[PDB]
RNA sequence: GGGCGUGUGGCGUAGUCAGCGCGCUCCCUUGCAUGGGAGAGGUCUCCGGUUCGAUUCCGGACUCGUCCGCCA
RNA sequence: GGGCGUGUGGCGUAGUCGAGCGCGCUCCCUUGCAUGGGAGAGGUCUCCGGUUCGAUUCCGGACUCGUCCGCCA
RNA sequence: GGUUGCGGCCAUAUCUACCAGAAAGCACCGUUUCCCGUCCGAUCAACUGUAGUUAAGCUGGUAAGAGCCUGACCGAGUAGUGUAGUGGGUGACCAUACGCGAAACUCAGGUGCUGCAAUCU
RNA sequence: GAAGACAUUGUCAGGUGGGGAGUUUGGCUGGGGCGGCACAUCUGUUAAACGAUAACGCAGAUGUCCUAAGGGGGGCUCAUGGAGAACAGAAAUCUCCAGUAGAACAAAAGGGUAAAAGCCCCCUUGAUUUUGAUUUUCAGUGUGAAUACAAACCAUGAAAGUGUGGCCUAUCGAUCCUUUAGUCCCUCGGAAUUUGAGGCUAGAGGUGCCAGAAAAGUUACCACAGGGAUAACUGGCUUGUGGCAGUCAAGCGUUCAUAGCGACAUUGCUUUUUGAUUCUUCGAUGUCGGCUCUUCCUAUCAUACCGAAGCAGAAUUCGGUAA
RNA sequence: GUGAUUUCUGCCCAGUGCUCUGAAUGUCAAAGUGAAGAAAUUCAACCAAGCGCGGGUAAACGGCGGGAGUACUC
RNA sequence: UCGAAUUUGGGUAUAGGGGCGAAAGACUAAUCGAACCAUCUAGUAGCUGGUUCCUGCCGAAGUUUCCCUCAGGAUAGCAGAAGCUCGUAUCAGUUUUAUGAGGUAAAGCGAAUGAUUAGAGGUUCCGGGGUCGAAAUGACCUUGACCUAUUCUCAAACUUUAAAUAUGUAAGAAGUCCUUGUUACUUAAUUGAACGUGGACAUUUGAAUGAAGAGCUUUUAGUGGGCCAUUUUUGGUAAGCAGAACUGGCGAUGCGGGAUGAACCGAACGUAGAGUUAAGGUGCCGGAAUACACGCUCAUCAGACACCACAAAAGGUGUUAGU
């Protein structure tokens, strides 16, 4: 599946859950008890990857929540035209479909391709939709 | 949580024995059963088919079925407040027959001849066996077997 | 895992009765139908007042399906279904395993 | 901040090694079980006196050390460093558990009783029985009476009954006295470090011959 | 409110009141578990040997 | 008392069973602005186990920062 | 009340059993919006005993200070 | 009785170090055209039984040999244990009654037996 | 006058809507809450040598992984140690010897395995079809897992044979609904054809609280049925902890174990500490402290009479009979 | 909402609300439109408000941290 | 507090999820965190209480599995009733004989795994510290490793060995032997497999003891909180504590004894008479020897009977007997 449930309490920070349909990023936990019989429950506030919006959700604790399938893949750049980055596997396979960042990060990385060094490219999967982080040079292997 | 799987409390039950281990022998492959025939359940560890359960080990039961490489025993088993019938498949590795019924035939056919035999005289076969009866009147003799004197030693650290 | 695309298996139909070529695939569950049974009653039994009438299941456990190899004999079109253990990654793309090579 | 002995006197429990299942023990108190003149020769020392309990009980490491030093330290004072050779001889192997619990007041508010109350190591214990040598000294003749009475201050620090027995064997051998000279009178003992190897009728001649001449010197 | 969770106390008792009988034996067991290839002859073989009981005492 | 997190070169940290950046120190280049290249620098808190190999996997220990310890 | 750790020159602070630096100011030299430089003084290493050959250093005790936990319904 | 082929029980058969082996049989041994397999005719494959040798394998013997096997009134009726008592003892534990009964140790002996077929001074 | 086919009104449809309505807000548990999962399972042990056997007992593990790490066959022998060979050393590759497994077999643990069940190579899909029987848990129900066959069709090998997933013991899921495969069979009931729908047989989508409800709190404004099956007093058992007392004597005391003390050890007593437990009381035994008043205990602060001193006197310390 | 007078009411619009005469295909009902079909029907395009994007607002609910150097600075 | 945000009469308005409130959840006819009246309504309750005549016979359970199951049910077990088919057996909480199986108690560690004390002899291209050495893969001592032969002590999750007690099967007629019929199974083959025909072997017909009838079926009650004692045993310092195994009890049970007491000892019960006893006793209470015999003990806290209602370490020219 391409998303899996959880336990509020079995969550912990720097984890994916998924807040509204979104793949968000725990920055900060709180428990505190609902009475004094009663169960505590958790606050969660967390950072939507792709678009750095913060969410917070507070739950039971015995709730479950759902948790995105968040996998961190290295390509290595071919070209960056019209905001679409192209990208090689190893074993040379090629996507184009990765569209170019809008921030920063896609500014510093149009210098650093016009001024030509080899750039090493990380973009995430979550919950079928895709994106570009950051971006290193290989140090060895020019 | 309790753990009660189809192997738990086998450690010592199933291992080989000492010295022992190793392939088994061609013996208990030529050795041959037909229905009706009483065997004893002695699994064996180095055979992990047709492996009885650990509550089969040491029962002794009747074989009603032959096949290929396996045999079909009747066991009685108690549960709760009566014995039922439960019917294994065990590959002959796990099995040999019970001497104590090969004993009894033996039994049988001398008693038999002694009885075929004693029959031309009619001398009161007295086929029975009998216990261990009170041992009888004897004499005893000193013909040098003088009796000697015992007594109690006294008491020692020994250490 | 790993499954290949072509299996050679029996086939139960009516003309083979043997071990023919089978090319696999994996079983999609396609789109519920409207005007089943089951659908036309909830709908009626949801129109009106009163509600959520039927539970909804919240208590979700597993984080995994079984998978299903759909079988489909190369002579007389006939098809299989066969189920498989419980796998987080599933490929039938053939990529066999090489022993004695390098990481 | 120890509890006292009586909790743990008795055998009540199977015994409970250091081993990988337990993996965070406490080491012993005592450590050394040789003393004396321990690189002495075999026929240096031909008396040997044993206290031997009397009991069926747990003697505790903390209480052996304190006969060790006890003992050791009567005899070196009143006979000499090297008049002697005492061996402890049995070894704290079993462990102590303790499940503690909290001395503070309104300390139900946070205790939660029996539960759980599977304990932790904090000593360790030997299990002896009855008839069994705690301690065995060996010396001359000429020291018997301060062994006896050094065994006797030492018998203080031991809960339960203690005897103190002259051994009619010859040192921390297995022989008598005369069985011991009749064979040492023939060449068939051989010195070691403390001990003595003895001949046997088994074995190759060769190896019999290269040890052991002088009984072959016949 | 913890409780006894588990004992085997009187339960020997109550299986030897009108307990531990052995299960009645017959002439002719079950032929279940038996195999087929057996059975599917033997059926044949008993078919014949009542036929030559037939013609013999008829 | 119990639970959780924490230690990576000076700092930020990242990580596959020790990387850069900014610090540091040199060298080179060219302003309006600079940039580049070298090095010295890290027992990945510590100690074990596992594993071909462990920052990474586990166990134990230390430090520090938190959160609970309530009804009578 | 108990536990744990702490104690260095006028001040702060470094100490593996073989008391240094910085700050205050003593003097001299040297200077507007007042500096710098050079030689100074300064300890019973909290105290008392033992070990050593000699304890800041090791140990035991006492004093002092700082933390932590503790009464009732 | 020796040897070979196939075995059964699977150390009384194994291991260490020496010694001996008539005859026959095994064995080492000679060769690479063919079948076949290797980096390598070393193993495996094939050919010859010729050129040779008991050196080794194998078999047997030796050793106050290691191991293993058997037995003992050897330890020891000991340890342990089923049953009993308004038995002893503060207790820990221990005696007795009716029964069952070890292991280590010590000592003595032994070191393959045998089935089917073939063959041998 | 204004406005005008727009507002308004009617019916549907989307949004908003604690303003209001109805309802819910697991279990085990040395009381409940927090914690944990002992809630479905697996290995060793507790477990008392058939089997069965508990605790919030101990040491751990599971919700995976694998087209080979399945099946068949062939060849070979592993961990380690010793002795050698350029660069090359503690660890690179090669050679010999010893090597009962001290290695490896996906994972936890325990068994099993040496011309293999291990390592390497070759060929494959039996991890296939059809329904029965049996073992474990057990009500001899289900589920999971497994065993031996029958009827086919295959793989492998020269062949005997072996193979119905993983060397064995864990690795998982009902009714209803949806969907797929098969039969292309049955039905749509006035008669037909074609769509559509409904059936039969076998799978999948999942209930981990794992024989399977669809589910947030607070109440110090509170209520009812009950409970001493169950906590907060006293009392009772126990005495870890608290308090008090001994035995031994390495030392302190200038010298000197014991005038006075006394380490390392060890034997006790008490119920004026706090725990532990839950026996009595929940159709109620009034719950802090103080004031007032009586009596009892002695482990004696003072007073009486004494013994000892590191008791010259003075002051003091230790101890005895004594409440 | 705060609670006479006097004297003041600092910083923060990220969150939750509230509010825009902004900009306009992302979400996107019924009716209506188009295609396929023999029809039931299926599939698309188009698609109001509100969400989503962009601003404002603290006498709205509220909030007002760490590490170094020498109160101050980084 | 008392000249006003004053006090108050009468009239009038607001009515129950509604009113009114300078706000206390206050007031709304002694009723308010949702008034009162009637009806639905004899609302439901796994929870508390009660449940009405006698005698006779039989007579329990607090355990298995599943359940939002833990104060409740279902199911199995225990029990009663109705019997039915037969007539001494296709029996047995027992022993013997024969034959299996087990890994606890014990034992073992100069046997494997693991822990562990002490020396001895060796190994240095093969250790570290010192001293002598120009230095030296130098030397001399010392200390660590590794090997060899010893030595002391251990193991719930170690083991070569290995009990006792428990535990499976057999001790015939449904058996044994001889001969030959069937088959589509099986074999090279009337070879074998299974079931058969005909014939022979009978009261010692295949060990002991006892049988009280043996076998079979239907239906249904109550129960599903248990507790205690000896022995084995787990957690805990321990407990009249918590949790297991086998048996016997109490619950459900009176009687004699333990003064007294659910469980201990003895023994189980119709109504009476006589005799004899059990356990326990025989100075008096109190029925029964102030019996007999040999010793021991004198306590300025004697001692006096199992469960059981407590006492230890250490001492004593008290006294007695011993080595
Ligand atoms: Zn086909």
Same mark, same amino acid.
């Given at each position: 599946?391409?998303?899996?449930?959880?336990?509020?309490?079995?969550? #912990?920070?720097?984890?994916?859950?998924?807040?509204?349909?979104?793949?968000?990023?725990?920055?900060?936990?709180?428990?505190?008890?609902?009475?004094?019989?009663?169960?505590?429950?958790?606050?969660?506030?967390?950072?939507?990857?792709?678009?750095?919006?913060?969410?917070?959700?507070?739950?039971?604790?015995?709730?479950?929540?759902?948790?995105?399938?968040?996998?961190?893949?290295?390509? %290595?750049?071919?070209?960056?035209?019209?905001?679409?980055? !192209?990208?090689?596997?190893?074993?040379?396979?090629?996507?184009?479909?990765?569209?170019?960042?809008?921030?920063?990060?896609?500014?510093?990385? %149009?210098?650093?391709?016009?001024?030509?060094?080899?750039?090493?490219?990380?973009?995430?999967?979550?919950?079928?939709?895709?994106?570009?982080?950051?971006?290193?040079?290989?140090?060895?292997?020019? | 949580?309790?753990?009660?799987?189809?192997?738990?409390?086998?450690?010592?039950?199933? %291992?080989?024995?000492?010295?022992?281990?190793?392939? $088994?022998?061609?013996?208990?492959?030529?050795?041959?059963?037909?229905?009706?025939?009483?065997?004893?359940?002695?699994?064996? &560890?180095?055979?992990?088919?047709?492996?009885?359960?650990?509550?089969?080990?040491?029962?002794?039961?009747?074989?009603?079925? $032959?096949?290929?490489?396996?045999?079909? $025993?009747?066991?009685?088993?108690?549960? &709760?407040?009566?014995?039922?019938?439960?019917?294994?498949?065990?590959? $002959?590795?796990?099995?040999?027959? !019970?001497?104590?019924?090969?004993?009894?035939?033996?039994?049988?056919?001398?008693?038999?001849?002694?009885?075929?035999?004693?029959?031309?005289?009619?001398?009161?076969?007295?086929?029975?066996?009998?216990?261990?009866?009170?041992?009888?009147?004897?004499?005893?003799?000193?013909?040098?077997?003088?009796?000697?004197?015992?007594?109690?030693?006294? +008491?020692?650290?020994?250490? | 895992?790993?499954? @290949?695309?072509?299996?050679?298996?029996?086939?139960?139909?009516?003309?083979?009765?043997?071990?023919?070529?089978?090319?696999?695939?994996?079983?999609?569950?396609?789109?519920?139908?409207?005007?089943?049974? &089951?659908?036309?009653?909830?709908?009626?039994?949801?129109?009106?007042?009163? /509600?959520? =009438?039927?539970?909804?299941?919240?208590?979700?456990?597993?984080?995994?399906?079984?998978?299903?190899?759909?079988?489909?004999?190369?002579?007389?079109?006939?098809?299989?279904?066969?189920?498989?253990?419980?796998?987080?990654?599933?490929?039938?793309?053939?990529?066999?395993?090489?022993?004695?090579?390098?990481? | 901040?120890? #509890? @006292?002995?009586?909790?743990?006197?008795?055998?009540?429990?199977?015994?409970?090694?250091?081993?990988?299942?337990?993996?965070?023990?406490?080491?012993?108190?005592?450590?050394?079980?040789?003393?004396?003149?321990?690189?002495?020769?075999?026929?240096?020392? @031909?008396?040997?006196?044993?206290?031997?309990?009397?009991?069926?009980?747990?003697?505790?490491?903390?209480?052996?050390?304190?006969?060790?030093?006890?003992?050791?330290?009567?005899?070196? =004072?009143?006979?000499?460093?090297?008049?002697?050779?005492?061996?402890? *001889?049995?070894?704290?192997?079993?462990?102590?558990?303790?499940?503690?619990?909290?001395?503070?007041? &309104?300390?139900?508010?946070?205790?939660?009783?029996? *539960?759980?109350?599977?304990?932790?190591?904090?000593?360790?214990?030997?299990?002896?029985?009855?008839?069994?040598?705690?301690?065995?000294?060996?010396?001359?003749?000429?020291?018997?009476?301060?062994?006896?009475?050094?065994?006797?201050?030492?018998? +203080?620090?031991?809960?339960?009954?203690?005897?103190?027995?002259? !051994?009619?064997?010859?040192?921390?051998?297995?022989?008598? #006295?005369?069985?011991?000279?009749?064979? *040492?009178?023939? /060449?068939?003992?051989?010195?070691? /470090?403390?001990?003595?190897?003895?001949?046997?009728?088994?074995?190759?001649?060769?190896?019999?011959?290269?040890?052991?001449?002088?009984?072959?010197?016949? | 409110?913890?409780?006894?969770?588990?004992?085997?106390?009187?339960?020997?008792?109550?299986?030897? *009141?009108?307990?531990?009988?052995?299960?009645?034996? +017959?002439? +002719?067991?079950?032929?279940?578990?038996?195999? @087929?290839?057996?059975?599917?002859?033997?059926?044949?073989?008993?078919?014949?040997?009542?036929?030559?009981?037939?013609?013999?005492?008829?």
């Amino acid at each position: 599946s391409a998303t899996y449930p959880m336990q509020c309490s079995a969550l #912990r920070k720097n984890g994916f859950v998924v807040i509204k349909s979104r793949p968000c990023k725990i920055v900060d936990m709180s428990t505190s008890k609902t009475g004094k019989h009663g169960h505590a429950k958790v606050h969660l506030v967390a950072i939507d990857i792709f678009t750095g919006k913060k969410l917070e959700d507070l739950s039971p604790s015995t709730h479950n929540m759902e948790v995105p399938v968040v996998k961190r893949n290295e390509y %290595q750049l071919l070209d960056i035209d019209d905001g679409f980055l !192209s990208l090689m596997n190893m074993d040379g396979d090629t996507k184009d479909d990765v569209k170019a960042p809008e921030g920063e990060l896609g500014d510093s990385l %149009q210098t650093a391709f016009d001024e030509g060094k080899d750039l090493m490219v990380t973009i995430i999967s979550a919950m079928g939709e895709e994106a570009a982080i950051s971006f290193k040079e290989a140090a060895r292997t020019d | 949580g309790k753990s009660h799987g189809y192997r738990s409390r086998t450690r010592y039950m199933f %291992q080989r024995d000492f010295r022992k281990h190793g392939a $088994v022998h061609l013996s208990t492959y030529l050795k041959v059963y037909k229905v009706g025939d009483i065997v004893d359940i002695k699994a064996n &560890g180095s055979i992990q088919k047709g492996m009885p359960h650990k509550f089969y080990q040491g029962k002794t039961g009747v074989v009603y079925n $032959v096949t290929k490489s396996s045999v079909g $025993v009747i066991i009685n088993k108690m549960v &709760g407040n009566r014995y039922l019938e439960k019917r294994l498949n065990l590959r $002959v590795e796990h099995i040999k027959h !019970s001497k104590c019924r090969q004993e009894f035939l033996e039994r049988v056919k001398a008693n038999a001849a002694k009885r075929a035999e004693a029959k031309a005289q009619g001398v009161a076969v007295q086929l029975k066996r009998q216990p261990a009866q009170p041992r009888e009147s004897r004499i005893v003799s000193t013909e040098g077997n003088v009796p000697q004197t015992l007594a109690p030693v006294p +008491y020692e650290t020994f250490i | 895992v790993n499954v @290949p695309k072509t299996r050679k298996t029996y086939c139960k139909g009516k003309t083979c009765r043997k071990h023919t070529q089978h090319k696999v695939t994996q079983y999609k569950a396609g789109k519920a139908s409207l005007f089943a049974q &089951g659908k036309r009653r909830y709908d009626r039994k949801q129109s009106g007042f009163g /509600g959520q =009438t039927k539970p909804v299941f919240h208590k979700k456990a597993k984080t995994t399906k079984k998978v299903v190899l759909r079988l489909e004999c190369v002579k007389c079109k006939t098809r299989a279904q066969l189920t498989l253990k419980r796998c987080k990654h599933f490929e039938l793309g053939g990529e066999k395993k090489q022993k004695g090579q390098a990481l | 901040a120890r #509890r @006292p002995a009586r909790c743990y006197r008795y055998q009540k429990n199977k015994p409970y090694p250091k081993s990988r299942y337990n993996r965070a023990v406490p080491d012993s108190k005592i450590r050394i079980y040789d003393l004396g003149k321990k690189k002495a020769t075999v026929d240096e020392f @031909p008396l040997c006196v044993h206290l031997v309990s009397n009991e069926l009980e747990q003697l505790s490491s903390e209480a052996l050390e304190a006969a060790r030093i006890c003992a050791n330290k009567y005899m070196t =004072t009143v006979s000499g460093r090297d008049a002697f050779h005492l061996r402890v *001889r049995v070894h704290p192997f079993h462990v102590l558990r303790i499940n503690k619990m909290l001395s503070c007041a &309104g300390a139900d508010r946070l205790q939660q009783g029996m *539960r759980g109350a599977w304990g932790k190591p904090h000593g360790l214990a030997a299990r002896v029985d009855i008839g069994q040598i705690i301690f065995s000294v060996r010396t001359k003749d000429s020291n018997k009476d301060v062994v006896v009475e050094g065994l006797r201050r030492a018998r +203080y620090k031991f809960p339960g009954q203690q005897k103190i027995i002259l !051994s009619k064997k010859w040192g921390f051998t297995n022989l008598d #006295r005369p069985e011991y000279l009749k064979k *040492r009178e023939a /060449g068939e003992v051989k010195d070691d /470090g403390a001990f003595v190897k003895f001949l046997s009728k088994k074995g190759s001649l060769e190896n019999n011959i290269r040890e052991f001449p002088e009984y072959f010197a016949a | 409110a913890k409780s006894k969770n588990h004992t085997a106390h009187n339960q020997t008792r109550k299986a030897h *009141r009108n307990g531990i009988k052995k299960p009645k034996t +017959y002439k +002719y067991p079950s032929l279940k578990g038996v195999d @087929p290839k057996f059975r599917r002859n033997h059926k044949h073989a008993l078919h014949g040997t009542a036929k030559a009981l037939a013609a013999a005492k008829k």
